[PDB]
Each structure stands twice: as C-alpha cells, then as structure tokens.
Design a protein around this nucleic acid. Structure first.
Ligand SMILES: *[C@@H]1O[C@H](CO)[C@@H](O[C@@H]2O[C@H](CO)[C@@H](O)[C@H](O)[C@H]2NC(C)=O)[C@H](O)[C@H]1NC(C)=O
Ligand SMILES: *[C@@H]1O[C@H](CO)[C@@H](O[C@@H]2O[C@H](CO)[C@@H](O)[C@H](O)[C@H]2NC(C)=O)[C@H](O)[C@H]1NC(C)=O
Ligand SMILES: *[C@@H]1O[C@H](CO)[C@@H](O[C@@H]2O[C@H](CO)[C@@H](O)[C@H](O)[C@H]2NC(C)=O)[C@H](O)[C@H]1NC(C)=O
Ligand SMILES: CCCCc1nc2c(N)nc3ccccc3c2n1Cc1ccc(CN)cc1
Ligand SMILES: CCCCc1nc2c(N)nc3ccccc3c2n1Cc1ccc(CN)cc1
Ligand SMILES: *[C@@H]1O[C@H](CO)[C@@H](O)[C@H](O)[C@H]1NC(C)=O
Ligand SMILES: *[C@@H]1O[C@H](CO)[C@@H](O)[C@H](O)[C@H]1NC(C)=O
Ligand SMILES: *[C@@H]1O[C@H](CO)[C@@H](O)[C@H](O)[C@H]1NC(C)=O
Ligand SMILES: *[C@@H]1O[C@H](CO)[C@@H](O)[C@H](O)[C@H]1NC(C)=O
Ligand SMILES: *[C@@H]1O[C@H](CO)[C@@H](O)[C@H](O)[C@H]1NC(C)=O
Ligand SMILES: *[C@@H]1O[C@H](CO)[C@@H](O)[C@H](O)[C@H]1NC(C)=O
Ligand SMILES: *[C@@H]1O[C@H](CO)[C@@H](O)[C@H](O)[C@H]1NC(C)=O
Ligand SMILES: *[C@@H]1O[C@H](CO)[C@@H](O)[C@H](O)[C@H]1NC(C)=O
Ligand SMILES: *[C@@H]1O[C@H](CO)[C@@H](O)[C@H](O)[C@H]1NC(C)=O
Ligand SMILES: *[C@@H]1O[C@H](CO)[C@@H](O)[C@H](O)[C@H]1NC(C)=O
Ligand SMILES: *[C@@H]1O[C@H](CO)[C@@H](O)[C@H](O)[C@H]1NC(C)=O
Lengths: 774, 773
RNA sequence: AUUA
RNA sequence: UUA
C-alpha cells in the first residue's frame, strides 16, 4: 500500500493546517544529519545525537526551516552521559544558518559552545544557549539578534557546569535588542543586574546567581515587566542538597524600598531563597497587579506574624511562605498576622516548614473570610496536635494539605529544596472528587468517629501512610456522609470485620493497598467479602497486600467496576487441588477491569476463567512468571477486550486466536519467550486492533500468520526487539514491514536483523533482498 | 592437566574412606540414564529428570550400587510442573533391581506408580514410595521386603494427589516385616490404625488421615515406639489454608484412656489438629519418658487452665499448646493452671494463638520455678497490654517471644497452619544471649521506663513496630548490656546524633526500612550518630531511601560492616557536588561495605579515594553501572571481594593486575560484556574466584586467560554466554574440556550459540577435529 | 512450587 | 544527555 518505503530514521509528520512538516530525529544515535530530509521541512529536531559539526551542507536544501532544535549533541562533562562523554565541542562552520531566511527558533543548548554563534538570520525570534560554556556577553556579539524576542543564556556557569570566573555582561549589552521580551540569565554566576535593559522586557530571570545588592534603578525602565525572578541570590543554605554558598554575615539580598517602583505590570515576583528577614511594605506601593509571590526559603518566621506588606496585595492569587522557620526552633503554634485577612483574591496559601507543635482553630482566623481561598498547604510542619473539626470553617476550600506532619491522638516530591525547579531537559489524585483533607504521612494510629466531627462536607480523605493498625468495624468514619474517595494505603488495616468501611455510604473509590502487615502472619482471620456493604463502590485497590489466605471464599459487589489485586498471592489461594477460592471474584457482577499481575501465577489452575465475573473486559496477568497458558480457556471470558500477558514466560501463541476469543481487541504479549508464530495465528481475528509482540525471540513471520484483512484493522502492531533472521526465507516479512501502512513503532531503532552475519545489526526497513530474486 | 575429559552430565565424586562413588545427575533434563556411569558407583541420584522407564539394562553394569535415588521422573499432575507435565507413569520392567545385590536404599517417590515394585533384593533396608498412586497395601506385595527397616508410603492419596477412595491395608500386612523400624503412612486417606504392627517399630507416622477412632489395643505391642504422630485426624479446620474436612458432629479423634499404655519408650507424641477438648491424665500413666508433646490446633482453651495431665510429665522438654482459642472469644487474660509448675524438665513452652487482651506478671507464676525453661512463645495472641518488666523473673530464658501482637503504651513464617510441615522435596540474634522479641507489635513511643528491670537483655527485637520518634539517647537507659538491637521497619527520625548512644554495649544495629522521614525533603538527618557507639560492629541501614544528610561524614573507630543498600548515593554523589565523597572515609576499621541498589549509573571521581583504608568486600551490585574506571581500584589497597553483578558494564580492565593487586574475588555476572581485553588476567596471581556468567561473551583466547592464572581459581563461572564454537575457539574449548578448575553448569548451560551446526551444543561435548586436518 |  |  506504499510505493516508496520511508527509510529516514526520523518521525515525519504533517500539520497541513499550519503548513508544518515535522521531522523528529530525537535520540537516534546519529553521527551526521541523515540524508533525505524532506525539502519542505519546517521543524527539524536533532536533540540527543552525536553530530560533531554544522556546516552550510547541514541545512543546504532545507530553506523553509522555521525551527531547528539542535540541543545536546555535546552536553557538558558533568551534565551528560558518563558512558558516552562528548569528546569535543560542537563546531559551527561559517554561514551555517545565514541561508535559512525563514528561521524563527534556534535551540543550541547543551553543545559546549564557547561563544554566541554568529551569522544568524534576522528572522530569528528565539535563540537558546543553555548548558553551554558562554560566560561573557559583549554588545557586538548581540548586534545580529536585532529582532530577537526570547533569549535563554542560563546554566552556562554553575556548580554542575563551572566557568570558574564571574559572569560578565557589557554595559547596555542588551539595550538595542528592541524587541527582547524574555531574558533568562539563571544559574550563571552573575554578580550584578545587567543594565540598561530594554523596556520591552516581559520576563526577567536572574535566579541562582551571585547578585548581592539590587540598585535603586536596576529595573527603572521595565514598565512592561510581568515576571521577575531573583531567587537564590544570597541563598538560604540549611539542608540544601546542592553546594550552596551564602552571602557573608548572613546578609540578605539587599533590595532598595523603591527598586520595584517602575514595575506596574508585574504579575509574578519570585524571591525564593534570598535570606530575607523583612518584607518592607514600601516594595509594593506601585504594584497593584501582583498575582503570584514566592517568599519560600527565607528567614521570615517573625515577619509572618507581622506582615504589613499584605495590605498592599489585594489582587494576589498565590502566596508561598514555606520554609522560613528559625533554625533549631520548634515553635508552640502558628502566629498568622491579621494582615492575611486583606488578601481578598488569595486562592493558594502555602506555609510548609514553619515548624510548630500545635495548630488550633483561632490561629487560622485571619483566613476565615478569604472568600476565594481554595488551597491551604500546611505540610512538613511537624504538627503534633490538630483538632480536624476546625476545618468546618473551610468547606469552600478544595484541598486542605496536612501531609507530612506528626498528628496523632500537586507539587513534586522534591520541590522547595531543589536547585532549579524549572530546568529544561534535553528532550522536550482525588482532588477531582471535591473537598480533600490530606492527612497522609502522619502519626495517626487510632481513629474514632468523633475525630471527624463537623466534616460531613469532605469528599476525599487521604489517610495514606499513617500508622493505623486497627480492626475497622464500620464505626470509625460515621460523620463522613459525603466521602467519595478514601486513600487508606500504607497502613496496617486489620480486616477482621466484614462491616469495615460500611459507614462510608457514598464511597466510590477505596484504596487499601500496602496494608500487608496482618496478611503476613499465619492463622489470622481476614474478611474479604466486606465489599458487599458498599453500594456505590466503583473502584477497589488492594495491591501489594501479600494476601495468601482468606476466611471468606467470595467477594460480593453489585457496583464494583475495577479491582486492583496486584502484588498478592493468588498462587497460594488457587493452589492446584484447592478449589475453594476459584470463584473469589465471580460475584463482582459489574466488574470490568481486573489487575492480577504480580501474583506469582506461574500457571493458572483450571476453573480460574470460569470463575471470573461475566463482564470482565480488561484483564492483566502480567509479571507472573507464567510458564504456560491454555489459550482455549479465553472462551469463558465472553466480554474480554484487553488481555495483558506482558513480562511472563510464554513460549507459544494459540494456533488460531479467533477460535479462542471472539471479543479480544487488545492482546499484549510483550517481554515473553516466544520464538515463532503458529501457522494461522491471526486468521479471521476480525476484532483484533492492538497486538504487542515486542521483546520476544521471534525469528520469522510468514504471511499465513498475518492475514492482511486483519492487519489493516490494527491501530498498532509492535514487533521491536525480537531476533529477526534476514535470510531469503524472510522475503515476505521484510517486504511487508517496508511497505505497510500499519503503525509499527521503532522501525528506525529496534526492528533489526540478528543475522545472517552480513546483515547483523541492520534495520529490517533498510534491507535490500534483490539477490533473492535473480 | 586431565588426560580424559569428563563428558558425563553428572557430578561424580569419590569419598574413598567409605569407598563410595557418588554420581549425582539431579535435574539434568535427561530422558535416558546416561551411558558411561562409573562401574564402581555407590550412590546414583537421578531425581528430577524425564526418564520414562527402568529396565534390567538400567543398572546392568552398576552392581556395586548401595543407593538408587530415582524420584520425580513422573510427578503426579497437581504436584509437578504444569509447563512440563509428565505424560505417562514411569514403567519398571521385571528384574530391574534383582541384580543389585548390595542395594540398601531405593527411592521411587513421585513417579505415579500404581503398585509396590516387586523383585527387590533382600539387601534392601529403606524403600520410599511417597507421592505415587499406591493406595492398597497387600501382605503379599510386602514379602520381598523381609529385611526392611524404613518404609515411606505417604502422600499417595490426599487433596493434592487424590485417589478418590479410602486407603486399604490388609490385616497384619506389616507384621512379618520383623526388622521394620519406621513406617510413614501420612497424607493417605487412611481410616483405621493398621493392625497388628511389628513391635520392632520405633517411629510411626499416621498424620493427616481419616482416622476417627483409636482402638484400646491399636498400639498394644509397640514397646519400642519412640515417635508417634496422629495429628490431623479429625482436624481443626478454622482458617485452614488447605481443603479441610472435620470429623462429623464436631467430634475429636477418640483415644481410649489406656491406648498408650504399652508406649513405655515413647519420647515424642504429636496430637496436633485433632479437635481435642480434653487431655485425660490417664493417657500418660505408663509413659514417663515423654519429652516432646504437640497439642497445637485443638480446642484446649479451658483445659489450659486445668491441665491435670501435666502432673504425669516430669521429663517433658517441649510442650506446644498453640492455637487452641475458642472461636470468636477474646479472653481478658491467660488462665495457666498451677499444674505447669510440675514440668521440672521443660525447656520450650509455646502458647501462640491463645488470644487474650492483657498479660500481667501473676499469670506466669506457674512458670517461675521451671529452672530449665529456655523458650516462652506467646506470639499471635493479640495482646494489647504487657508490662515488660514482668520478665525480670525470667533472666534464665534464652528467648521471650511476643512477636505479632498489639502491644502499645525460629519457626517458619507458615508453621502451625501448613498441611504437612515435614514433607520432603524432589531434591537471627538468639546467639547473642537473652532475647526479647517484640517484633510486629503496635509500639509507637519508647521511654526509658518501659525497660525497667531488664538490664540483662542481650538482643531486643523492635522490628516492624510503629516507632516514629526522634531518639536522643534517653530511650534505652536500662538496657546496659544490649548487644543486638533490631529497629528495622519503623519510622526512626535521626534528628539527634545522640541517638542510641546510651546502648554502650551495642555491637549490631539494624535501622533498615526506616525510610519514612528520609523520603520528605528538607528534614534534618544526622548520619554521624555512629561516633558515640564505641563497640558497634555491624550497622544495617538498608532500604532507607537516604538521599540527603546534614552531616557530611560518618564516624566510627569500631565498625567493620556497613549495609547501605537501597539508598540514593546517586543523589548524594551527584556529579559536581563533592561534599559527600568521604561519607564513609572515617569508618576506619570498616571492612565490608554494601552499596548495591543505589542507582549509581556511574561513580564520580573521588568515590574510591574516599573509601576507608581497610575495605575488603565491596558490593556495587544492582546499580545500573554503565561505566567503571577500573584504574581507580588502585586506591582500595585491601580489596579482596568486588561484587559488580547485575549492572550494565561492557568491558573489563586492560590488565586487572594494574588495577588491584590484592583482588581475590571478582564478580561480574549479569552484565553486557561482549569480549575480553587481550591481556585481561595476565599476572593477576592472587585472583581465586571469577564469575563472568550471564554476559554476552563470544570468544576467550589464551592471552586473556593465561593458565598460570586459571589454575589458581577455586571456581570460574562462564555459563549463559554467547560462545562461538569456530576453529578460532580451539584453545578455550580444549581447556574447558581438560581443566581441573571448577566450572558449574558445564552439563547444562555452557553452550555454543553457533555456528549453525553447533547451535545449542555443549562446549564440553564439542568435537573440533576438523580444525586439525 | 518437580512430594512443601 | 540541561532536572
Ligand atoms: C563564580 O565566581 C567566583 C568568583 O567570581 C569563582 O571563584 C573563584 O574560583 C577560582 C577558581 O576555582 C578560585 O581560585 C578563586 O579563589 C575564586 N574566587 C572567589 C572570589 O571566590 C567561581 O569559581 C565562579 N564559578 C563557579 C562558582 O562555577
Ligand atoms: C549412599 O548411600 C548410603 C546407603 O543408602 C547412605 O548411607 C546411609 O546413611 C544413613 C544416614 O545416617 C544411615 O543411617 C544408613 O545406615 C546408611 N547406610 C549404610 C551405612 O549402609 C549414604 O549416606 C549415601 N551417601 C550419599 C553421599 O548419598
Ligand atoms: C478419601 O476417601 C473418600 C471415601 O471415603 C473419597 O470420597 C469419595 O469420592 C468420590 C469421588 O469424589 C465420591 O463420588 C464418593 O461419594 C466419595 N465417597 C464418600 C464416602 O465420601 C475421597 O475422595 C478420598 N479423598 C482423596 C483425597 O482421595
Ligand atoms: C524543616 C525542619 C528541618 C530541621 C528539622 N529536622 C527535623 C526532624 N528530623 N525531626 C523533627 C522532629 C520534631 C520537631 C522538629 C524536627 C525537625 N526539624 C526542625 C527542628 C529541629 C530541631 C529543633 C531543636 N530541637 C527544632 C526544630
Ligand atoms: C488467632 C486469631 C484468629 C481469629 C482472629 N483474627 C483476628 C484479627 N484479624 N484481629 C484481631 C484483633 C483483635 C483481637 C482479635 C483479633 C483476631 N482474632 C481473634 C478473635 C476474632 C474475633 C473475635 C470476636 N469478637 C474475637 C477474637
Ligand atoms: C514549529 O516551530 C514553530 C516556530 O518555532 C513553533 O512556533 C511551533 O510550535 C513548532 N511546532 C512543532 C509541532 O514543533
Ligand atoms: C505574633 O508575632 C508578632 C511579632 O512577631 C506580634 O506583633 C504579635 O503580637 C504576635 N501575636 C501572637 C498571637 O503571638
Ligand atoms: C474539637 O473541636 C470541636 C468543635 O469544632 C469540638 O466539638 C470537639 O469537642 C473538639 N475535640 C477535642 C478533642 O478538642
Ligand atoms: C495521598 O497521599 C499520598 C502521599 O502523599 C499520595 O501518594 C497519594 O497519591 C494521595 N492519594 C490521592 C488519592 O491523591
Ligand atoms: C465497633 O467498635 C467500636 C470501637 O471499638 C465500638 O464503639 C462499637 O460498639 C463497635 N460496634 C459493633 C457493632 O461492634
Ligand atoms: C462474609 O463471609 C463470612 C463467612 O465466610 C460471613 O460470616 C460474613 O457474614 C460475611 N459477610 C458479608 C457482609 O457477607
Ligand atoms: C486496561 O487496564 C489497564 C490497567 O490495568 C490500563 O492501563 C489500560 O489502559 C486498560 N486498557 C483499556 C483498553 O481500557
Ligand atoms: C473453534 O472451532 C470449532 C470447530 O468447528 C468450533 O466448533 C468452535 O465453536 C470454535 N470455537 C470458537 C470459540 O469459535
Ligand atoms: C526480628 O524480628 C523480625 C520479624 O519477626 C525477624 O524477621 C528478624 O530476623 C528479627 N531480628 C533478629 C536479629 O533476629
Ligand atoms: C531526651 O528526650 C526525652 C524525651 O522528651 C527526655 O525525656 C530527655 O530529657 C532528653 N534527654 C536528653 C539527654 O536530651
Ligand atoms: C554531627 O555533625 C554535625 C555537623 O553537620 C554536628 O552538628 C554534630 O554535632 C555532629 N555530631 C556528632 C556526634 O558527630
């Protein structure tokens, strides 16, 4: 169905609306720009390769190029591969770009360059040079960038990529860049705010540098500035997980009280890790539009209790005051100044790392009438005592986050303590349910109904990762009449009573995963038929519980649709000869998705499929060490659409898959030991739409196994990483792969000959087999 | 160095003292008995193969055989592999054994046999027929076994291997076996004690059967019986993890009170899981030698508070009363009868699964004067309250076991609840002194007062509790002699570097799986807490997810072993951050360092220089190491063991001599090594163990493997490679065939991948004569 | 899990 | 392989 097979090792794509032809050669182990790129190419990406040089021949025929992404073909020593270090800088020969008359965006990050490349076309609006070795900016080297609007020069001199001197910027270096909207000089060992900057600036990024003082007039003209980030000049270095040098004498970044006067358009101000001890109200006299303010990682512990500056910020949406605690101090309580009540627009307030023993309801009173408040984040505060009923005055909130505290009777895992949370890479929850009380990672070991008094409004409660080691009998959550999602994972649930959780009469999702403790000790009673009582439960997760025994023999539900039962011991419950648990899931009448991967099921006893509930659609048996599989038994599963058998030990496929399942749509067989396909494998498998045979040991595929009326249905067909043998016997397969319309990922990189000798390591897509036709 | 290569796929071994020639073909995927077994062979083992038949030709020349182990060549369907089910029972032709005039032991278990193989020699003393399909014993079929002493007939009819009828035994079938010492009829669907039995019996095993009643005289003559197991007749089925059918009418196994009268020599009596509700003293009137008595898995809850029968047991060493609780009852406390005080000889007492809320010192008083008591096991009792100071009255004990309870302010994991704990297969801190095992409880806070009066303790097990606390050294004051502290699986918060410093006798500390507080950014961790513990030998901090540390050095002048696996040294040693490159340098006496599973895809320069000076055994396994500067091994001047298994290395050093000139054991299994450097092992004279298995090597030439270096080797592992058996391979193939050096799996996984002709062929059998024409 |  |  293809007259000319695609041989270029890049994903080519057409967006005819925007007349873009996209050529993506990301990470193709290329040592030169591959030949045969479409001359109509607009966007060409060549990141993560080892192309040693660029020359006029590089883009010679590609005169329609709007964007060139040529990053990380020589990433600096400490940043890149240690197995494949780049030997020498990328070389850009003269005139390599001057011919690309339409080029608007040029990325040359991560190539160890020493200087701003010259000869760039005046069409250019974005130039990116992060992670190079350019640490001295001269106004002459910038003349060529007249029409530039976006300029990234950061990460060219910092601990992971040192230049061993200060960053140097000539006076007015940037001033004649009259269209410059975004200037990024982060992570560069800069020592003063470069001046004068063009008043066209909208975004200025100066963070993680060596700037100790702001001059009064450093931002005098930037009356279009919207984002200003000065974070990490004079850093707070306590528990920093990267090398950190503070300003002498514990000095803060010194900011004159009038330094922001010109910034009437400022929407974002970031002063993270600037070791500040005061926030002068004078700063915000002529900024009335500020929406986002980060003051995390300073020394504002006392200022939080005063905080007059908040009276000047009526339009503020986000305020972050996290990690301002005084060292070695465990405060008794949280002193929140009354000034917080003047933050009429506040949607998000974050005060992690204040560190205090006891939170009591009045202390949050400055917040009571903040009508727009959606998120209150008091995590990582070592709170020991908290009456949860105080949040009855915060029903309007979407998330109350008390994660990581010591209470007893989304942001990244590493966020406040990383070096550059916004660093670019070489390539490129229950909040939905309503009000959420996150109590995860606390010290709750016993819960009683009263603990939730006055919180009937809660829709999701996260008790994950506490110490609850208790038999729940339905009396513990009584007030939570509207709860839809309970995350109870990483506790020590003791399912003695089949009335556990039955008081949560609106519960749709229940996670009791990683509660393996009591299931790990022999002879203890576990009631798995507790599902009968939850009449609107859709989804149950009981993964990684080590379940090997069960007092009850069947689980019952008239509502349950998804059961995650992964990481347990169904091999033990279904031990050959023991018939008592073969219908464990049969009475989950509405169940459509069953995950019983990672259950040590090296074989499936007869009765397992007959015992499945009648509407099972999607079944995972992955990661089981399955050594054998009687495919005929799929006939029992009359609504089976997806079968995941990945990461097992299967060595054969069924003789005729049609004769096994008349419903099967998605068959996943990846990472098995299959060495050949049956003669008529896919014959009349008219329902088949997705087939993954990748990561096996297949040598040959004949036409009988792959009828073309079945292959034209297939949305995807995975074959990479097999042991394909490219003799003349393989002529049909090699022809078909090269000429097929079917989607086959990784033809450029992992559909390969193992032999014979002559062809080893060669791609099947490039194979020439004419010698078989003489 | 060998003139005739061994080609037999069996390990041949000679113990000339007992003039035994042992030939072990266990699990060699054999479909016939290999030819060429040494004629002098004594023990021949052929278990786990697929030999379909035995015939007179089988052992024709092997007339010196004392033992034949021929088990599991046709395992019953539900017991064996389901990927390779045996298609048809093993077939034993007439005369197969009559010629083996010296044959004393014959194992034919797990072969799906239907009948007792006949024609056995009169020399035979042990016959084993477990896991076959023999469920009818006839006295006629037993004549040939005149001189037999050990006879195993169990597992021929049970849930995993059903026969669908009752087991049948003709009367006096065993009586003329005048030398018969041990008879095992376990797991057999037996319905009465077979009679009469030969009085020569010492061990009789009838457990897991369908015996509903013992007759008065069933054991009348067995006055040499030493062990009797009747367990699992009328079983207690509550929470049984196997199919379990109780005796009707909630009846127990009925034993008339005089049934044991003849059993004067009985040392062990096992009545586990017989649904008993009473233990009549009359049973034990004429046994005073009893040492071991199992009464677990009955219904003796009340009888434990009465227990008159114990007065008849002054010689008893072990007593097990575990899992007698009455269903649905959570007693307030443990009523132990005073009769326990009469167990003058008792060393081990076990009462798991009594199930009661509060244990207090008075309940244990009957135990106060049992001077020989060594073990008290009160686990799985759901105890909520226990003043631990009550054990001040038990300093003499070796183990006080409160594992798996609900306390708050070794036996196999499955033991009391398995079907047959003694079934045959087809093939700790106690040492340190008094041990208080509190593992798997609900302790969430520790204060010094909790250990008042327990200074005698040597090992304290707190593993698997809920301790989520900063220890400042004030929590363990009374434990002045503690040598072993297991604190794993808790939530230790190392805020204070004075943690544990009060335990000034601590030699080993496990704080593994205390990852909780290490998982959350910005929290202070003091890893230099080791400085205060002046006698600490072994520190385990495995699986803690440590990625950050306020302190930059760990300090100890005593510590010799540090387990640091499952952490994030990749983050602490992030390229460009030099501050933790000497984390371990001042562990001056450290000899063993485990930093496997640390995501170290590379080792930054400085890591090796930062190692302490006496490092002997260093594991970098399971790290995804893609690259390794072998030269930097020069810094490690005392390195004896280097474990680099399960990584992504593609090369070995150009000269291992020039890298480490002490290295004895180099482990490189499961990597991506495709070829050896030309002069690899040249002059590496101290090397004694080399594992290159599970790599992708195609060729090995003599340059890389000089023979003055390979004869050094205690072992040399090469299996699961990609060996190419062309004429280029002539030296390697010759050396493998003729070497004395031990190379495991030569029979089964040292294989040519090619070329074509030789694909899948064993290197040991390879004929390369065409290369010499 | 090739007698658990 | 800019975190
Ligand atoms: C950032 O700038 C500082 C000073 O401008 C550099 O520090 C010097 O580094 C050299 C070489 O390591 C030392 O010999 C000097 O003592 C340092 N001078 C001062 C004043 O500290 C630093 O190396 C620069 N580069 C970075 C941090 O990557
Ligand atoms: C070789 O076979 C003999 C005979 O089966 C084994 O010797 C027996 O070992 C037990 C162990 O205590 C003794 O009770 C028997 O009396 C021995 N038989 C005798 C002495 O005739 C021997 O263990 C086997 N050796 C190996 C290595 O398999
Ligand atoms: C143990 O023996 C009993 C007989 O007492 C077997 O039970 C019979 O099994 C067949 C087939 O399942 C039934 O049709 C009979 O009705 C049963 N008879 C009785 C009296 O129950 C039992 O199967 C045997 N057990 C094993 C494991 O072989
Ligand atoms: C974000 C705070 C980082 C420093 C820190 N680390 C810890 C820690 N591991 N455990 C604690 C436990 C209770 C209170 C505070 C801390 C604490 N703290 C805060 C703190 C530490 C020490 C002191 C002095 N006792 C007061 C407060
Ligand atoms: C050896 C024990 C097997 C049965 C069992 N299972 C559990 C369990 N999962 N949690 C408990 C928690 C507290 C007390 C008893 C049990 C218990 N128990 C004992 C028990 C169960 C049920 C009752 C009835 N209230 C009393 C006592
Ligand atoms: C293509 O490049 C243009 C110009 O830089 C850019 O605006 C657009 O987002 C790119 N599109 C794709 C799909 O790469
Ligand atoms: C909070 O602290 C500020 C100064 O830090 C002080 O003005 C105020 O009175 C304090 N309020 C309370 C309730 O402690
Ligand atoms: C918690 O506060 C609520 C009122 O919001 C009150 O009803 C309850 O008694 C308090 N509980 C405790 C333990 O202080
Ligand atoms: C609950 O919190 C844990 C840890 O904070 C998190 O992993 C989990 O995804 C949360 N649950 C939901 C339902 O968001
Ligand atoms: C459930 O347990 C709670 C607390 O242990 C108790 O108050 C309540 O009476 C129990 N309910 C039932 C039905 O047993
Ligand atoms: C669960 O099963 C047990 C019997 O195994 C029964 O006692 C209990 O009442 C059942 N509970 C429910 C809710 O079905
Ligand atoms: C089937 O379920 C798995 C979860 O086990 C999910 O990841 C997958 O996308 C599902 N497939 C379909 C077609 O619903
Ligand atoms: C498979 O083929 C047989 C032979 O005709 C047919 O009777 C049977 O119904 C088929 N099974 C399915 C599931 O189509
Ligand atoms: C402590 O108890 C745990 C849990 O029972 C056990 O795994 C561990 O081996 C024990 N520690 C020692 C040192 O014996
Ligand atoms: C350690 O802390 C405990 C717990 O509060 C306290 O009892 C003790 O005074 C402290 N000891 C030292 C030496 O700091
Ligand atoms: C551990 O090191 C830290 C330095 O980060 C220091 O504060 C503390 O006193 C040290 N303690 C010991 C016992 O070495």
């Amino acid at each position: 169905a293809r007259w000319f097979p695609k041989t270029l090792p890049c994903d080519v794509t057409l967006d005819v609306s925007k007349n873009h032809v996209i050529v993506d050669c990301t990470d193709k182990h290329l040592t030169e720009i591959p030949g045969g790129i479409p001359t109509n190419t607009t966007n060409l990406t060549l990141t993560i390769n080892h192309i040693p040089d660029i020359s006029p021949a590089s883009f010679h025929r590609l005169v329609h190029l709007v964007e060139i992404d040529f990053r990380c073909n020589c990433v600096p020593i400490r940043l890149g591969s240690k197995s494949n270090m780049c030997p020498r800088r990328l070389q850009i020969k003269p005139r390599s770009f001057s011919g690309l008359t339409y080029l608007k965006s040029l990325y040359l990050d991560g190539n160890q360059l020493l200087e701003i490349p010259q000869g760039l076309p005046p069409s250019l609006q974005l130039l990116s040079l992060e992670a190079n070795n350019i640490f001295s900016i001269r106004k002459e080297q910038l003349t060529e960038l007249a029409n530039i609007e976006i300029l990234y020069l950061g990460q060219n001199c910092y601990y992971r990529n040192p230049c061993y001197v200060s960053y140097s910027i000539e006076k007015d270096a940037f001033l004649n860049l009259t269209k410059l909207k975004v200037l990024s000089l982060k992570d560069n060992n800069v020592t003063t705010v470069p001046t004068v900057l063009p008043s066209t600036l909208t975004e200025l990024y100066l963070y993680n540098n060596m700037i100790a003082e702001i001059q009064e007039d450093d931002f005098n003209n930037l009356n279009q500035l919207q984002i200003l980030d000065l974070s990490g000049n004079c850093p707070r270095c306590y528990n920093a997980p990267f090398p950190c040098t503070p300003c002498k004498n514990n000095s803060p970044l010194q900011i004159p009280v009038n330094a922001f006067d010109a910034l009437t358009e400022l929407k974002v101000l970031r002063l993270h890790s600037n070791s500040l001890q005061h926030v002068p109200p004078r700063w915000f006299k002529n900024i009335n539009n500020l929406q986002e303010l980060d003051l995390s990682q300073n020394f504002l512990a006392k200022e939080i209790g005063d905080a007059k500056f908040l009276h000047f910020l009526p339009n503020l949406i986000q305020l972050d005051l996290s990690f301002n605690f005084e060292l070695q101090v465990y405060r008794a309580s949280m002193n929140l100044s009354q000034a917080f009540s003047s933050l009429k627009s506040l949607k998000i307030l974050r005060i992690r790392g204040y560190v205090f023993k006891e939170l009591k309801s009045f202390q949050l009173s400055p917040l009571h009438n903040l009508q727009n408040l959606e998120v209150l984040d008091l995590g990582t505060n070592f709170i020991k005592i908290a009456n949860l009923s105080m949040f009855k005055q915060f029903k309007r909130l979407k998330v109350i986050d008390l994660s990581v505290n010591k209470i007893s009777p989304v942001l990244e895992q590493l966020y406040y303590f990383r070096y550059d949370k916004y660093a670019r890479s070489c390539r490129f929850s229950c909040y939905k349910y309503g009000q959420t009380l996150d109590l995860s990672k606390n010290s709750i070991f016993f819960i009683k109904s009263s603990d939730f008094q006055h919180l009937s409004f809660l829709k999701c409660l996260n008790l994950s990762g506490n110490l609850i080691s208790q038999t729940l009998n339905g009396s513990e959550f009584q007030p939570l009449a509207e709860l839809r999602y309970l995350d109870f994972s990483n506790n020590r649930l003791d399912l003695l009573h089949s009335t556990a959780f039955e008081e949560l009469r609106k519960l749709e999702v229940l996670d009791i995963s990683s509660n393996s403790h009591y299931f790990q000790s022999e002879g203890i009673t576990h009631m798995l038929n507790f599902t009968k009582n939850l009449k609107v439960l859709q989804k149950l997760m009981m993964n990684d519980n080590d379940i090997s025994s069960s007092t009850s023999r069947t689980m019952e539900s008239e509502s349950l649709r998804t059961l995650e039962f992964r990481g347990n011991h169904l091999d033990v419950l279904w031990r050959d000869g023991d018939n008592r648990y073969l219908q464990l899931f049969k009475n989950l009448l509405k169940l459509e998705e069953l995950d019983i991967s990672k259950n040590s099921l090296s074989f499936l006893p007869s009765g397992v499929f007959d015992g499945m509930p009648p509407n099972l659609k999607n079944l995972s048996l992955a990661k089981n060490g399955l050594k054998s599989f009687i495919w005929e038994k799929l006939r029992y599963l009359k609504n089976l659409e997806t079968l995941d058998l990945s990461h097992n030990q299967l060595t054969t496929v069924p003789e005729r898959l049609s004769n096994c399942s008349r419903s099967l749509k998605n068959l996943i067989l990846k990472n098995n030991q299959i060495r050949s396909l049956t003669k008529y494998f896919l014959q009349d498998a008219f329902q088949l739409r997705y087939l993954d045979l990748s990561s096996n040991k297949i040598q040959m595929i004949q036409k009988t196994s792959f009828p073309e009326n079945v292959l034209n249905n297939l949305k995807m067909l995975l074959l990479h990483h097999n042991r394909f043998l490219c003799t003349c016997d393989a002529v049909w397969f090699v022809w078909w792969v090269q000429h097929t319309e079917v989607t086959i990922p990784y033809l450029a990189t992992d559909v390969t000959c193992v032999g014979p000798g002559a062809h080893k390591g060669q791609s099947v897509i490039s194979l020439d087999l004419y010698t078989c036709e003489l």
